[model samples]
Target chain A: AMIGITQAEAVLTIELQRPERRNALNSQLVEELTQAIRKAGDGSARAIVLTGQGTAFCAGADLSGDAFAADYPDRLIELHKAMDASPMPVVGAINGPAIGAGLQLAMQCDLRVVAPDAFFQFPTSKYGLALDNWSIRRLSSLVGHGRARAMLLSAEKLTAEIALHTGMANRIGTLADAQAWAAEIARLAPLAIQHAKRVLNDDGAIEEAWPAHKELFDKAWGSQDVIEAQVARMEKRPPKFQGA
Target chain B: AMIGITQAEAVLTIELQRPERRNALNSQLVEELTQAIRKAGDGSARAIVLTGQGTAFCAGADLSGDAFAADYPDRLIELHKAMDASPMPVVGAINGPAIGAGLQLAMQCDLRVVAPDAFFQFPTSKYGLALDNWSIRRLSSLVGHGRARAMLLSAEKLTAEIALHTGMANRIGTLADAQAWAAEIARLAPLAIQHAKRVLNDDGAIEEAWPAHKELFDKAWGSQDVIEAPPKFQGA
Candidate 1:
């Protein structure tokens, strides 16, 4: 299998299993990864942890194949859209190098936990290609304009420490730490968590975005989970959230 | 003068001069700033550095007077638009606290250089007010959604160290460093730098933004500046 799917404690872990190629995304892997992400939203998993099988998280597009085929860009966009629409909070457990498209994939995750040996680089400029607007907008938002320019123009290879300092990674730890964080997110109120993800990913004008989610916000407030949260606080126990 | 205007080495520095009020912005200062920024594009300066006169960067809107008058929002939005439309890159030299609208003003700049003692906070939620769409949109883009929420929802105070760590500040230094950085930018190819700024500020859909700027980008590439850049860039 090009992709491995496992679930533990309501947190689904999607592993890129092509370690021989350092999980370089080929056409098959891309389809499988997209399918796996969509499947994670089937109400079984409350959170997601995406990682790699071995040392490298993803080495980027498989250059041996037709990476720039006619349908390649559309497929790539579809993958990003799937991640964006996911109701579960996606956490990237970057075990090693995340270069080019790999880095963009990591950026799509809500939060990232990187290992000490991990590094990030975007070599698009050198290859005479440009990232789509979504990638550009997200990159600038994630690291600000100056650093984004440096990365895009200079092809700066960001070390793990630099990535952390630049808000690219939420935490630096092992895969275990990444899974533990996902478990923590899994324990939260699913409705509220899903709503937060939706609001953040709106990416439209805030005037439309904020009001559009007002109903969802109200729903979370009036949810059974909120009452349970209050009761759990009073009873000195964990809230048993049914994602209601 | 409520605002101090100075020019050195093709870099214009605008200082908020009402230090007694911590440079709290009033109508007059807003008009003056809008004028000063517009005038900078008329060829006196290639880059700009905005800083406060004394300790605090403008302490948000001046509530003592008619700060919240009916026309104030329009005035404030106009000021931000002027900065946004500037062909010259604006660099903020944050010498002290930037609270509420003051923080919004700093966010308007193309780049920020913060003093070690400075901090940033948005108290709009606490004050029962909300920022405009431009402010909300730009803030989330500058910082990620998570940090943006922390600041807007919790009124989190971001220290200089955290600001630097988060990319809120391009560098940590004093007004001198900011001016120097602006000077460096001033020496670059104006056509290319301005085009970069224009594209980055386009908050619209990316498909239109990228192609729309392609002509300007091609123009920059074909300009004499590109020829000079290779020699100048390599010499250093």
Candidate 2:
């Protein structure tokens, strides 16, 4: 209900429509995005473009829903996996502020095109949450571990300038520019690009990394701090985290 | 290092010691293995051979060391991380029996060569903990889920012949044979083979595979995989 799907030639474009809430991801929106990505893969489209309708591409997850706490993780994983599993490349057009889950959505893209004003942030520590292994592994691999560590631990807003320099954003452009690149990428050697993308997305060091990292993410999410953050958000106060 | 580290030609071989206990893995041995592997990557070795000294490849974890080496779990992760981080390829020489953690050690290798009498068994269920997803995923991918289940759940002994047929063993040979193959593999385009091996080791779908799969074993390590085509046609 909060997403728009359109096909332009060989490129399929999926845009977030909840501009009022800055297209923030809720459980329903997550499910819609997941299903749409799968449909894009099933179709004859050669490339896909993901962008938003508003100034903010996505602010973050919409913490307003009661049901979100129950199924967001489950839905988030499905959405990410859908993009990963897609045969065609998905290019994210980061129109504006991409924060926390918003930034994560952009990361799911094979190629990211960020706008001049658009920025990146990982607000997990402040929000008393943890990113899934899929996100953590991909983030660490995309940029060097040092940059990823700073980005995650420092929890700073990364500008488009730095995002481009750090290799997070592929190119700075608008949604139309992103769509243009998708159609351009559509002209390349199909099988070679497609398969190479597969090997790239599913990286090495999986066996070692998965077991070591995944367990703590689960524990971290289930921590009292997560619940504390939610109650404080509702109570309109700052979360007081106990480092358990 | 508790393991014997030696270099012959370009192949660095790591042999599991403690033959008296059949090279049972203790925390100390695990740490040694980890360091030895990282050392292999640091040196001039283009390939590595992992084998055992005694009749048994490894009898699994040493259960007697003052309540089973409290940090063995941490050590196990480190050893695996070291192997994955190594730039060169590792060819496992399964000279004898490989059980439990020992079998997992062999699985980490990019290639595996098994002796005629060598076999594998997983006794995780018989003990306590479930096999970690790393081991479970590889085992299933290497031998298919049904066979993987039969081995892990039923606790069946998988012989060398079965291993060879099941895509678990790349070749049937002694430790010497494994070393020879490693040396042969070392002779190829190092970057291409190593980078391509990363893709292959990650796993796949055959039709879209191309450079990832065919490049590795087919051109990189295969006799059966490649056939020289007569150069007949002009540039088409």
Candidate 3:
């Protein structure tokens, strides 16, 4: 009930719908959104774009009246796992405010494009909230500890420009601009892109703990998707992959 | 018998002994050096400068004679561990030729200041020696995989200027000039300087693992030396 979608040019765009409260992540909405994402992953979409409907991508967990005080942590982790495991390369189209858990959700995507007017805030320390869903670890990796602490400890607000400088956003543009970027990615060989995403999530684990990432790599290479893309490239035509 | 020191206004310098064979690391030298560093931790030193006594910093493992080879790996790790554990800020003062294991040793220091006249060469790959120290892990962190591979694979000889641009050395100067810079670091508020070092090392750990680095921060706050220098800031 809380999710809306648009499909065009083989790209599936999922928009968070409760703009009245900045599309906050209440328990039911997060569940519905996760289901919507799984449906898109059934080989029905070439690419996926996750964004919000109105003035905010997501204002984070709905804590306006302590609505999230009881069961927010489990919901937050579920949302993150869904985003991380999505089959397609999920591009976060951040059009407006993305704060707290919402910011972490966007970061879970493979790539992120933020609007020039967008801003990000993480208020964990100021609010006495311990970051859930590995946000503390992920934030430190994106930007070094010095800059990460400056944001988390001070609950600082960052604009899109600052976000781009700090490695939070891959590119900066308006919604139209982000849509155009997504289309470009959608046209590429999905198999190659998916493999690259796996490698990225691998996070330099090859030397330290090899088995996990190596298994993912082997599966991707052995899939029909890889063969389809290879054949398509040789024939100078677009690939319509089975993705098995 | 194995450790000797020279003191300057802003620097406390430690020279690697065993100079007769170009300061190759011997067991007694390693143990004495570790003890000297422990003594420096008592607050008498600011920045610790490590250099060699002869024509070369180290000829890398005295491999020409097989006597040192059997115990080399453990001894090498011991020496690097001591350098890594030093409480004060450490700087590598590369005075002359540094080769193979020598290259690994210099990089163990927190910051490296290399002499313009000096050059670096690594034959570890060519000689079939495993560059198994934490040095490999650290180098990849500093310069990324592309450059790290280029150096490790080709075993390229690098000038000080090249090393500086490649992020290997923070500064390039003559041997004397490097010592002078080390002195300046030693004159700073010792605790503040050490905090900066601790924070950097902790940040590096974050790149690899999260909980491990959080533990490092907890350990830092428990140290008596953590806030020792702030009270003396008025004197500066």
Candidate 4:
């Protein structure tokens, strides 16, 4: 069973109870993990802190089981979609080794606070796996092209420092530092934070009058905070924004 | 007047020559520069270099006059369209200070090779004048959000080394060194270089199709000297 709980401070710490499997995302775990993240987005949490109980953040889809055979692509897509669409900002707190889906998991977050002891790898090519479309499209947006190609084609392991320099993580601090930073970010106005996230998701389309997708922008503009933001700018002071 | 000349190595150097005003881009200068660029894109010129000869590379627009009137936005858009649509690879060889419009001019290029003595600034905000749309968009893309805001809002003058590190310029070398590098880049197979530039312009689209892009990716796909690059890669 999944062993994690949401604290009153809006930090949902989901830890893999299976230290023996190195927190591999088993089939049942993936389904339950997706559900947990969905609940986090339904206003129950402001920030989701994903970490593992043992020496690995996640070993990726459990290979020993039939997890890979049963609609794996859909599962991977659902996980990514849930992470990306979450209203609350998600933070990946890497405690140790993170590879494959592990790397993808960390990347889906708006920001990552990597532990200096952690490292990452993407061994998809070795296992003869066609990565989710995001691994191709959005991964490069995280890191630059030169490094992304090296990871995908060469399947190399990247150290935490390299990842931090490349914008993979905003900062590399100890576990205590990561938790403290997450708490600070969690205290921000949820609507304002979500608007910022939506703006980034739209690729800074606040400038574009007609982007390929307009619904996302329209929905964001309709929020009460947007009107307050305009007045706040006119008044030359910080605006008190409600999630309404 | 417009100064357009092609080097023996097929490097088309387009100099902004209004020395009286440090080659500030006025209404007439923008039209002439756009025409010169269109002519250079006619196949013979393999590479384009934008430079100026004076104490400054360019002083941007002639804001001193009524040039930046209410209709200024339309004019700015039109000029940006010309620079952005140039087919050949454009390199900015910043010979001296590149300010305001001058900074935007250099950024329009595919690659920038700035002299160690050169610098850039954005003074549009100080005069209560709105910055051009291209500057806003391009600056954000060149550097990330925070740096872009600092440059536009604070209007700071950046040194060549800082510019290079920030992706405003691709490299920082002496004027002669920059010219030589541009020449070397020009001498490569023209089609191969153009395809690479196209891929860069296309951004993540070309990258997403890497499976297909890689299959058609070799220099051999377009160049007569494609075989030479294979041995060069193998030896290295």
- Predicted complexes: DockQ each: 0.03, 0.02, 0.01, 0.01
Worst 10 residues of 4 chain A by lDDT: A204-213
Where is the poorest 10-residue window by lDDT in model 3 chain A? A190-199
Clashing pairs in 1: none
Off by over 4 Å in 3: A63-72, A204-244, B1-236
lDDT of 4 at A13: 69
lDDT of 3 at A77: 61
Looking at model 1 chain A, report the run of 10 residues with the lowest lDDT sum: A204-213
Q: What CAPRI-style quality would you assign to candidate 1?
A: incorrect
CAPRI class of candidate 2: incorrect
Single out the weakest 10-residue window by summed lDDT for candidate 2 chain B: B227-236
Residue-level lDDT of model 2, residues A101-191, one tens digit each, is 8988887777788899998888888766777655666666555467778878878678998776555776799999889878866543333
Better of 1 and 3 by lDDT: 1
- Each candidate's fnat, listed in order, reads 0.04, 0.00, 0.00, 0.00
Task: Check candidate 4 and list the clashing pairs.
Answer: none
Interface RMSD of each: 20.0, 19.0, 21.7, 20.9
Which pairs clash (backbone N, Cα, C closer than 3 Å) in model 3? none
TM-score of 4: 0.51
Writing each residue's lDDT as its tens digit, candidate 2 over B60-135 gives: 8885763548888899989987887678889999999989899988888888999999998875433322344466
Q: For residues B1-236, what per-residue lDDT tens digits would candidate 4 score against the true structure?
A: 64555564677888888877887877666766777787886757777787887777887777457554555546555655665666677888888888888888777778888888888877542322334334555665675433443344335477787677668778886556656777887778877876777666555311122232222222223333222321211100
